[PDB]
UniProtKB/TrEMBL annotation, chain A:
Part of the full-length chain shown: 47 to 313 of 320
Location in or out of the cell: Nucleus
Main location: nucleus
GO cellular component, as recorded: DNA-directed RNA polymerase complex; nucleoplasm
Job description of the protein: Core component of RNA polymerase II (Pol II), a DNA-dependent RNA polymerase which synthesizes mRNA precursors and many functional non-coding RNAs using the four ribonucleoside triphosphates as substrates.
Keywords for this protein: DNA-directed RNA polymerase, Metal-binding, Nucleus, Phosphoprotein, Transcription, Zinc
Family: Belongs to the archaeal Rpo3/eukaryotic RPB3 RNA polymerase subunit family.
Annotated segments matching region Disordered: 189-212
Protein name: DNA-directed RNA polymerase II subunit RPB3
Automatic annotation (TrEMBL), chain B:
Gene3D superfamilies reported in the protein's UniProt record: RNA polymerase, RBP11-like subunit (3.30.1360.10)
Lineage of source species: Eukaryota, Metazoa, Chordata, Craniata, Vertebrata
PROSITE patterns reported for this sequence: RNA_POL_L_13KD (PS01154)
Protein name per Swiss-Prot or TrEMBL: DNA-directed RNA polymerase II subunit RPB11-a
Claim: Secreted is one of the keywords in the record: no
Family, similarity comment: Belongs to the archaeal Rpo11/eukaryotic RPB11/RPC19 RNA polymerase subunit family.
The encoding gene: POLR2J
InterPro entries given in the database record: RBP11 (IPR037685), RBP11-like (IPR036603), RBP11-like_dimer (IPR009025), RNA_pol_Rpb11_13-16kDa_CS (IPR008193), Rpo11-like (IPR022905)
UniProt entry keywords in alphabetical sequence: DNA-directed RNA polymerase, Nucleus, Transcription
Automatic annotation (TrEMBL), chain C:
Transmembrane regions: none
PANTHER family to which the protein is assigned, alphabetical: DNA-DIRECTED RNA POLYMERASES I, II, AND III SUBUNIT RPABC3 (PTHR10917:SF0)
Organism from which the protein derives: Sus scrofa
GO molecular function annotation: DNA-directed RNA polymerase activity
The protein, known as: DNA-directed RNA polymerases I, II, and III subunit RPABC3
From TrEMBL, chain D:
Cross-referenced PANTHER family: DNA-DIRECTED RNA POLYMERASES I, II, AND III SUBUNIT RPABC5 (PTHR23431:SF11), DNA-DIRECTED RNA POLYMERASES I, II, AND III SUBUNIT RPABC5 FAMILY MEMBER (PTHR23431)
Major site of localization recorded for this protein: nucleus
Highest taxon of the lineage: Eukaryota
Name of the gene: POLR2L
Keyword Thylakoid included in the entry's annotation: no
Pfam families: RNA_pol_N
Protein name: DNA-directed RNA polymerases I, II, and III subunit RPABC5
SUPFAM superfamilies to which the protein is assigned, alphabetical: RNA polymerase subunit RPB10
Localization (cell): Nucleus
Function: DNA-dependent RNA polymerase catalyzes the transcription of DNA into RNA using the four ribonucleoside triphosphates as substrates. Common component of RNA polymerases I, II and III which synthesize ribosomal RNA precursors, mRNA precursors and many functional non-coding RNAs, and a small RNAs, such as 5S rRNA and tRNAs, respectively.
Residues annotated as binding Zn(2+): C7, C10, C44, C45
GO cellular component, one term: RNA polymerase I complex
GO biological process: transcription by RNA polymerase I; transcription by RNA polymerase II; tRNA transcription by RNA polymerase III
Organism, scientific name: Sus scrofa (Pig)
PROSITE patterns reported in the protein's UniProt record: RNA_POL_N_8KD
Length: 254, 115, 148, 66
């Protein structure tokens, strides 16, 4: 009638992705954890682009949309930052945003590459993660792009710019022991990387008493957060959501 | 044009209750929890944890419409145990589970980094 | 008791017309004592049975072995001693047809009772004396246990 | 028009690889080898660099209206 005792085993940990395994857990908790990786980990991404001068070939909304998609280093600052909608200011103070300034004038004849290197932050902790650098726009001789933009805290549910994951691989039952999927010709299907069968079987023998468990994860970060930070913030956020729901439920019952 | 704002899928507007309880008159000891501005994230996990309880005779959830943001969770229980008690116990179990998972994930990170 | 019928059967064919459902097989079985012919759709995936097996079969009105009616509703929390504990495979269905060799002049000597356990169909043919407990649109429990 | 910033499907950063991709192609790499060198394993990410048409280089031929 109570919680499982989930066990973690990290198989790989690089600076761009983390691969791990969770045993002793139901399918719903693992799926919600993957869902929270994708759509509920807050990061800092550019929003509120104000363009002072844009004589480039790409129109203004194009440049703003490209700026929004640039990932920003938000490893340790995002937790103490506040949502701008909740802050008490003109919506941009240092406690709820990070200012960015771009001012590029192409004077030489050669094609000028406006990259993420040209984004100057007012806070050193928050920079573009590439600082090759992400190309924003190419400028001709005589063209200019000059703007100031901010970066607010948000999560992937609101807009995909705030999604920190570059693809979250999730798997369970690599040998199809539970037969949650029914191969018409199981011999034709390649073995998963976590499969434990020999090269004469195609599926594990069917287990009627089986239950989903030993969920394999591979969380690849776009760069704005370290992958371990993504997972820790994900679990913290889901716990926070459940605690807030418990608070509201208690208030409703009383 | 008619596109809804992106923020109104997790934000409660003024005078909107996060969660509302209504007794189901069709069956004794059955309740419906309508939680606004939520999705399958809480619905599926709460449903699974409620199914783990032995005293819960029924536990299910549905989103009435994907474009809208509500989850209706129906919980029926044995006569000696209320649905509200089961719901609270399920959420506390999930919170304990995720706290333990956080601690063990931190320990695993420290071992992998040291190793 | 509430046991409409009881016997020991042996499987004489597993899937006679070729496999048509990857999880369900239509066992054809004979009874050594009552000499009933049995056709019965069994979910082989969870309860695998192969050819030549033997099993006690019981068709019962209830499971509580006291005459208490089942109510036809799923109660996972049942403290009463269930007859199903003495069996490996348990199904719940409704008899939907009782044919026989009756004429307008004489009653039936042979009866064939058909049951539909949620779709899994069973037919039980034999002499009429042992199928007097069967009556149409009544709920029954099929309790099967393999015998060594 | 110009290389997209993210991969449309998975969201991986791709905008910081177009110039490197072209440079590898000038080094006589097969396109599969170039994409493997850039570290795009999922075919969703590979599709974007493999199928991108860079029209901004053509748009920069025209003089600006200043
Ligand atoms: Zn502020
Ligand atoms: Zn991709």
């Amino acid at each position: 009638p109570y919680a499982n005792q989930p066990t973690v085993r990290i198989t790989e940990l690089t600076d761009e992705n983390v691969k791990f395994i969770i045993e002793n857990t139901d399918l719903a908790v693992a799926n919600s954890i993957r869902r929270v990786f994708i759509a509920e980990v807050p990061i800092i991404a550019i929003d509120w682009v104000q363009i002072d001068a844009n004589s480039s070939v790409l129109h203004d909304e194009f440049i703003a949309h490209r700026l929004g998609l640039i990932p920003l280093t938000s490893d340790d600052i995002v937790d103490k930052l506040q949502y701008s909608r909740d802050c008490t200011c003109e919506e941009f103070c240092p406690e709820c945003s990070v200012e960015f300034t771009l001012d590029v004038r192409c004077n030489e004849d050669q094609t000028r590459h406006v990259t993420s290197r040209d984004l100057i932050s007012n806070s050193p902790r928050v920079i573009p993660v590439t600082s090759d650098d992400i190309l924003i726009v190419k400028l001709r001789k005589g063209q200019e792009l000059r703007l100031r933009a901010y970066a607010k805290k948000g999560f992937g549910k609101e807009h995909a710019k705030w999604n920190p994951t570059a693809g979250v691989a999730f798997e369970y039952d690599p040998d199809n022991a539970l037969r949650h999927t029914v191969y018409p010709k199981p011999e034709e299907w390649p073995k998963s990387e976590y499969s434990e069968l020999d090269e004469d079987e195609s599926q594990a023998p069917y287990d009627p008493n089986g239950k989903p468990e030993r969920f394999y994860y591979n969380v690849e970060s776009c760069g704005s957060l370290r992958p371990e930070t993504i997972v820790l913030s994900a679990l913290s956020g889901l716990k926070k959501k459940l605690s807030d729901l418990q608070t509201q439920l208690s208030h409703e019952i009383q | 044009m008619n596109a809804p704002p992106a923020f109104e899928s997790f934000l409660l507007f003024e005078g909107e209750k996060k969660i509302t309880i209504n007794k189901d008159t069709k069956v004794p000891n059955a309740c419906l929890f309508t939680i606004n501005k939520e999705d399958h994230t809480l619905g599926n996990i709460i449903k699974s944890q409620l199914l783990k309880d032995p005293q819960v005779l029924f536990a299910g959830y549905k989103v009435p419409h994907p474009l809208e943001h509500k989850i209706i969770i129906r919980v029926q229980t044995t006569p000696d145990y209320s649905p509200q008690e089961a719901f609270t116990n399920a959420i506390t179990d999930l919170i304990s589970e995720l706290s333990l998972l956080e601690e063990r994930f931190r320990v695993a990170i420290k071992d992998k980094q040291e190793g | 008791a509430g046991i409409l019928f009881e016997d020991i059967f042996d499987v004489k064919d597993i899937d006679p017309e070729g496999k048509k459902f990857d999880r369900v097989s239509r066992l054809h079985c004979e009874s050594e004592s009552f000499k009933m012919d049995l056709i019965l759709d069994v979910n082989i995936q969870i309860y695998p049975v192969d050819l030549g097996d033997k099993f006690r079969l019981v068709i019962a009105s209830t499971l509580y072995e006291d005459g208490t009616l089942d109510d036809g509703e799923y109660n996972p929390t049942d403290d009463r001693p269930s007859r199903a504990d003495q069996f490996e495979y348990v199904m719940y269905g409704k008899v939907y047809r009782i044919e026989g060799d009756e004429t307008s002049t004489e009653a039936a000597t042979r009866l064939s009772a058909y049951v539909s356990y949620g779709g899994l169909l069973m037919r039980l043919q034999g002499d009429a004396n042992n199928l007097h407990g069967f009556e149409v649109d009544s709920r029954v429990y099929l309790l099967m246990k393999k015998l060594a | 028009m110009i290389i997209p910033v993210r991969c449309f499907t998975c969201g991986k950063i791709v905008g910081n690889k177009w110039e490197a991709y072209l440079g590898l192609l000038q080094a006589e790499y097969t396109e599969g080898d170039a994409l493997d060198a850039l570290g795009l394993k999922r075919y969703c990410c590979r599709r974007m660099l493999l199928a991108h048409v860079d029209l901004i280089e053509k748009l920069l031929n025209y003089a600006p209206l200043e």
